[PDB]
Amino acid sequence: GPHMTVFHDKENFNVKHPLSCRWTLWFTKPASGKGDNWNDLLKKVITFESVEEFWGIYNNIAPVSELAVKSDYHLFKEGVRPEWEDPQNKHGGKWAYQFKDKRSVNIDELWLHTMLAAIGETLEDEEDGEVMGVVVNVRKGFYRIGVWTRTTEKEILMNIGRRLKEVLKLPPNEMVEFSGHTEAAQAGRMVV
Amino acid sequence: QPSAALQSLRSARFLPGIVQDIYPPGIKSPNPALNEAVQKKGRIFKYDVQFLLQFQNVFTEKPSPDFDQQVKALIGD
Structure with a gap:
């Protein structure tokens, strides 16, 4: 009664579904064809706090x-x-998987599910305090999807890697790899 | 001018956490087993992907009235 969700009336509803923190979508653009912008490519798009907002964003980008x-x-x-130099990423790293073929992969669904695992808090457990963000890279020969972590320490990190492997629907032979962001971090094989 | 859905979103109250008993017929709730183990149930909200996908064709309006133009100007050369 007191609650009308978007499923009860998609135009006139009065409750929304919280996320466990606020999240920000960022976009890195290609260097400008005008030749005057190779160094200012990272853009903050929008910050959101609810499941409904996420979908309004996803359905309109x-x-x-x-x-x-x-x-x-x-x-x-x-x-x-979403830069290694952020104080919360500087000593961290990422689990990542490169899809060696851009055509054999429902990349949109895999990226969507990666974001949904992130915002739905199914990548890591309460108080693991490791997931900082997720990222998809579009490159000439490949896509890459990764989960950025706060540290490079450990069972908490390995389970995050296995959960990403599951979200990406990868078969056992395909390995997700952990790497530190900095050379020193990585200097000090972790695969699932 | 903001869509009716966006007006609703802006004025809506957050649910207090994961709730099981508020959805209409045919809509699943978030998996209660994922949340059974959470201690801070007023802060940490675990939603299975299947639950979240139910919204995909339901909230489709833009998150701001000028969103399309805003994104274009942010990104365009």
């Missing part, structure tokens, strides 16, 4: 399969820039 080469989407917890 280009899917991965429509992006130009050398574009990225980044979905990061509010306050974390």
